[PDB]
Symmetry: C2
Subunit: 801 residues, 2 copies
């Protein structure tokens, strides 16, 4: 017998949920059971706002548990996971005896939300329970809502009137779908009624009656009413349900709340897609394009018509085909045919004064959008269009750069206006490596090469830029830039001009940030100093080569109980906003993870408000406005923060804020369901378990504002119990103290603390713009905030921790 | 607004199972579905041996999953948890495409056993599945079997004929219960049939017919046939089932396999309970008492009879009342009345030659057990009863001491016979602290005090012992022992006499063990040396004060993923057997757990057998015999080892074994269900999931013996796949190579590797005695093994690792 000798070839294999399977038993649900269940659930803080289909599904997941006398169910110490509705016998309760429960009552509702440590201890006096486990319960809620969402979404996709909505806009109105049930013989819509609702058959069938005469029958997927979302019209038919039926419905009143005017939205989308085929309008902003959409002259034309001929329509600069075909001519030569969505006019858009030489002639019946000299001027803010488009093209390039992006509008404009132009010949060194630069460049025409030590590094072309560091530092150029084309033209600005425009506090912020960011740093180059945080642990460290001081968070590797650290690091590294903590580098070893970030020395906002007391309006504008810019930045990158509270915001030494703890943040993909956050700040929709997005961060804004202005928290303020906090959030009353005298503040607080997201301000199509334009922010200059041109409420004297 | 300022009062909240809930959907099970399921399950390696009630319950737990075309189900990398039976459509398979499956087939059976990494990747070509998750599946199997066990147990408890069975004996026959189903109108037993089966109604009803005439009707709990387990009798009635019924049944043939002769067993239990009321027989062994039970004269007597009178029945020494009452007299004085279970005769049992002075007279009709001079002599092994009881009382005391417990029987007897007696007066120092002792003492009569530095420590009385260390060492007495009574008498033995009896290798084993055990050791007193194991890590350490070398296992605290370490430490500390590793102390700190144990220097048995090749019979007797003593010791303490294999056994420097890895060991409370172990060694019943006990260690004995004698493993020998190993274990063929020429070896191997535990040798009432008495062990002296009086197969030259 040969034996295997590879010694390590054979490898060995190694709460309430445990005890409750002892009592589980199959049991058919009779009507008496089902109705008691529905009765119990309709009174549960989580299920009270559910329809009958939802509550029924939940019911069929309940399980039967039988007990004999003297048996235990829950215990005062153990962590809870089950929720029970009593079905027979009596059950005694014993915190630290207290009561007795029988047929109909329920207990352990807190476990339906989180792993709450039990309080009492329920035991069976007599000798059954309907029960359900948290995981099963929340998984069921997730699946119910998620499938409802996905189904309604695809039904939205099949309704032609929504075809030109963007992805984001489609998802927003999917959330507005209401489900209506129709018993057989019920009339869904009646002929001649000026209704405003679109119906989709999700399940069932219905019959169509025109003048009391059967005209056809409708099946799942059939839909009707799409014109009633755009116009005041009478129903063309009477529709009556044969079978019980399921209808996804969208109302126009809700559409207008979620989207505004559907026709206006669809046309912006269409026009924006057309305009962006042009290299010119591709430099315009979304708002600028929307404005051009809102003012374009739309005309229908017969075939063989001269829409534009030489000097005939003198004001038109650009032409977009919406439907049909037109042919372009220069004099007698056809130069092309434009179909649906294509356009013409780049030449005339750029040169306001140039006479239209071309001819446009319809080939068939068509519909045309015309952009005139006045639309352009109105879109841009003045009559000098040529100059204003050049100005705006330069604005577009620098508004993408951190350094220029957050300057006030007047500062930005002054810089654009200071730009000079110069030209180079091929092989000219625009910049020589090693020399001390004082200029910033933007390539207007041509191409250049980036080279260091003879070795090429990159090529740069039109609208590319280089050299910006010379605006902030006195230092040698690290690379040469060489004209790699005939007649390269550059726009440029001098450091001296920049320093006349940017002011001290912004300059200081940029100076310290770029340097710190780009500096290479190694662990052994780092000298620890004093400690400034225990929990992981955070030390004030000191870069030996540069003397630049940083902060270093040390996260014990033993704390890796999980996967989210890989995800937190991803998010934390990508963040590049003035009001969000800037990560420098991440280090790792045997025992500990490391985060190297900028050092923030002004303390927590949690302490600043307790030192200020109750914030005046200007002071609450400042901090809430700051938080709003940070949160808006994250949402644009589809990141939900999920743990907004004053504790998680630091003040830098100039008194501007920095958001810092990204432990609970997440890149959202559709709806999120995980229960995460700090209870006093959590949104109703997180607790209720039917899905949420980025807009939970907006609810927390409201909580914060309320603390700023009113003082205490708005819900669960003197509550310790996690469950009682959630209950006050879900159904408690929101009130304001009598010393709050600002109606606009109260309006804003009430609208940020709106429980259904669809009614929550800042949660519809305009996003944060509805918050920024609220009358609470009336006298507030959002422009000066990001640019550090405002006096902050509180500036630290020296460092604070 | 006062705000809460306690900064840390608010605290934030933080595979296949995930994707499959996307596809879950409620679905009523129609007959077509249920029958396909049952069909699929009856062909599954786990469920093939289940009855219809079991398979039905499993079926109702299956869940419906719907898929559209192109959807994924399992993926080649992911860890598996689901098992699927296809219900519609076709599903493609792709390891690293390979096949296509449709209506009826199943996949993912390996996950029904363990967290097996998937291999293929099944995806839906067309556009349903019946599915079940491992946890749910095994939880269901556990509950089915556990409730069946518990119910049958309580039915056993209600059957009067089993009343006098011990706890262990009741549980053993519960496992023998067979469930039989009876359709309405079926006859369970027919009048006049010489049946041998006991029936219990677990559920249903039945009707009793005597001479074709209805005599009564039976309900759940009613039982019949208890005399048919003890005697050849005809059924008194005909019993026919009205309703479908559930019967727990016990056959006499199985009873005899599991227990032997029920009447013999019940009477041993009864007699043992009676005899142990006497201080004399309480010193006898279980076997000695059973023998007295097997030979006692049982008699029935009329009332007013003289059972014993003076010299009338000269041979009787002891009397036990089984039923009824008798009265005791000394001459004409009544001295008491004995009822059921009480007894009389201590005086005459001790003094063989003393004439019976008493009179025993029945008060009513009674049944009496009589123990005669011949039963005593036969029980003890010779005619000199007085001496033999004294000898046996001394044997009882020292057989409880490690030092004497494992000596051969002849050695033990020689020691007992060398005992001398001495007497003390009150306040005499039997032992003076500080002096060098050479004697071992057993208190025959009286009391003594243990004192150190004047301060008393303890009192010791009859049958207590002290001083045993002076037999092994030359050292000062650490305490004084003082006669704290009038005329204390002691038995004692001299070191010189002990050293003439115990031989070198045993003496060396005891010398090294007691010293090492009792030595106090601190971490800083320990000097590391060479390393001898990587994984935790094990170092050869060196006690500075004593020069005693130990082994120190260092278990990284980061490896604490759990709770079982608290349990392993408990078990490892309690173990006190020569063939099990002896723990000294446990140490702990910030980064690591510590185990300080004896050092074992002869290497693994895994390597000894590969050096010996195929073991001769004497060599396999030696090692298997050694393992058996260790395993038997653990089972007596209700510990199941669960990971027996040659890897986990070390050889000490004398070539005797030591069991070492207690990671998988567990103190059993009823049945165990957790799947734990090394696959090639795991028992069928562990895999099948319907519960197991200590007897899985006996299956592994068989695996080991097979490797010893045959060479390769008996199942899954060249298999890598965990699933294919289990399948060969569950249903593969056991064969033996043609060069195995020992029929007794094969018989033993086949009987240790019996798949149903009830047929497995060593698994019935006699326990390991059936293995020790197997003809394979015919020429083997179990006595000399534990006492180290056998030449081992292999002795190391110097240390090995
Ligand atoms: N109390 C606590 C103290 N603190 N904390 C940080 C800090 C630094 C890094 C970071 O890691 C991310 C990754 C995010 C989280 C917080 C911190 C800081 N950067 N500067 C000063 N005090 C700080 C003030
Ligand atoms: N190869 C591996 C090496 N080894 N391992 C032990 C040992 C020591 C302690 C222990 O902890 C319990 C607690 C049990 C487990 C194993 C060990 C030992 N005691 N002596 C020598 N080699 C050993 C030989």
């Amino acid at each position: 017998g040969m034996r295997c000798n590879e010694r390590n070839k054979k490898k060995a294999i190694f709460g309430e949920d445990t005890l409750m399977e002892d009592h589980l038993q199959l049991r058919e649900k009779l009507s008496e059971d089902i109705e008691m269940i529905k009765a119990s659930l309709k009174n549960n803080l989580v299920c009270s706002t559910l329809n009958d289909n939802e509550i029924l599904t939940l019911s069929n997941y309940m399980q039967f548990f039988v007990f004999k006398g003297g048996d235990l169910v829950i215990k005062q110490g153990e962590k809870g996971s089950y929720f029970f509705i009593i079905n027979s016998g009596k059950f005694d309760v014993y915190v630290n005896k207290v009561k007795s429960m029988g047929k109909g009552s329920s207990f352990g509702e807190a476990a339906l939300i989180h792993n709450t440590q039990r309080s009492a201890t329920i035991m069976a006096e007599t000798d059954t329970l309907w029960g359900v486990q948290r995981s099963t319960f929340r998984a069921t809620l997730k699946q119910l809502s998620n499938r409802n969402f996905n189904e309604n979404r695809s039904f939205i996709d099949s309704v032609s009137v929504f075809d030109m909505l963007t992805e984001a806009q489609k998802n927003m109105i999917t959330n507005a779908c209401v489900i209506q049930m129709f018993k057989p013989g019920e009339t869904i819509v009646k002929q001649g009624d000026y209704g405003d609702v679109l119906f989709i058959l999700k399940e069932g069938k219905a019959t169509v009656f025109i003048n009391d005469k059967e005209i056809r029958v409708l099946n799942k997927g059939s839909y009707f009413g799409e014109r009633a979302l755009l116009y005041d019209e009478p129903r063309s038919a009477t529709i009556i349900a044969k079978e019980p039926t399921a209808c996804a419905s969208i109302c126009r009143k809700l559409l207008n709340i979620v989207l505004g005017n559907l026709q206006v939205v669809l046309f912006r989308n269409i026009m924006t897609e057309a305009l962006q085929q042009s290299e010119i309008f591709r430099q315009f902003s979304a708002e600028q394009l929307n404005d051009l959409a809102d003012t374009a002259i739309v005309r229908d034309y017969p075939a063989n018509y001269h829409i534009l001929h030489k000097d005939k329509v003198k004001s038109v600069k650009y032409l977009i085909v919406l439907e049909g075909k037109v042919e372009l001519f220069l004099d007698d030569e056809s130069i092309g045919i434009l179909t649906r969505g294509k356009s013409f006019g780049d030449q005339y858009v750029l040169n306001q004064k140039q006479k239209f030489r071309h001819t446009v002639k319809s080939l068939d019946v068509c519909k045309i959008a015309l952009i005139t000299e006045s639309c352009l001027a109105d879109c841009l803010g003045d009559n000098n269009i040529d100059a204003s488009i050049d100005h705006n093209n330069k604005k577009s390039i620098i508004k993408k750069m951190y350094i220029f992006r957050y300057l006030s509008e007047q500062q930005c404009n002054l810089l654009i206006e200071a730009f000079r132009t110069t030209r180079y010949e091929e092989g000219d060194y625009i910049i020589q490596e090693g020399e001390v630069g004082s200029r910033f460049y933007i390539i207007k025409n041509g191409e250049v090469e980036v080279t260091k030590n003879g070795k090429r590094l990159r090529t740069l072309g039109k609208n590319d830029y280089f050299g910006e560091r010379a605006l902030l530092y006195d230092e040698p150029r690290t690379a040469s830039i060489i004209s790699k084309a005939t007649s390269v033209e550059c726009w440029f600005v001098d450091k001296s001009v920049f320093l006349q425009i940017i002011q001290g506090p912004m300059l200081t912020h940029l100076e310290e940030r770029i340097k710190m960011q780009d500096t290479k740093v190694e662990m052994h180059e780092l000298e620890t100093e004093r400690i400034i945080g225990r929990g992981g642990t955070v030390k004030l460290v000191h870069h030996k080569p540069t003397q630049i001081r940083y902060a270093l968070k040390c996260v014990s590797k033993r704390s890796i109980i999980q996967n989210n650290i890989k995800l937190e690091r991803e998010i934390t590294a990508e963040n590049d906003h003035p009001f969000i903590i800037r990560l420098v580098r991440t280090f790792k070893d045997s025992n500990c993870f490391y985060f190297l970030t900028e050092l923030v020395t002004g303390g927590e906002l949690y302490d600043a408000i307790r030192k200020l007391g109750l914030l005046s309006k200007p002071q609450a504008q400042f901090y809430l406005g700051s938080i709003i810019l940070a949160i808006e930045y994250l949402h644009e990158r589809n990141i939900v923060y999920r743990d907004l509270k004053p504790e998680n915001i630091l003040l830098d030494k100039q008194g501007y804020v920095k958001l810092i703890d990204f432990g609970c943040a997440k890149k959202i993909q559709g709806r999120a369901y995980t229960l995460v956050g700090t209870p006093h700040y959590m949104a109703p929709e997180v607790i209720l378990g039917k899905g949420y997005g980025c807009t939970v961060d907006i609810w927390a804004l409201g909580v914060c504002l309320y603390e700023f202005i009113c003082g205490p928290l708005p819900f669960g303020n003197d509550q310790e119990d996690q469950l009682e906090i959630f209950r006050d959030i879900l159904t408690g009353q929101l009130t304001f103290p009598d010393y709050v005298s600002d109606q606009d503040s109260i309006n804003l607080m009430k609208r940020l603390l709106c429980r259904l997201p669809q009614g929550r301000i800042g949660c519809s199509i305009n996003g944060f713009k509805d918050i920024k334009e609220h009358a609470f922010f009336g006298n507030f200059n959002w422009d000066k905030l990001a640019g550090r041109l405002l006096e902050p409420p509180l500036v630290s004297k020296g460092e604070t921790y």
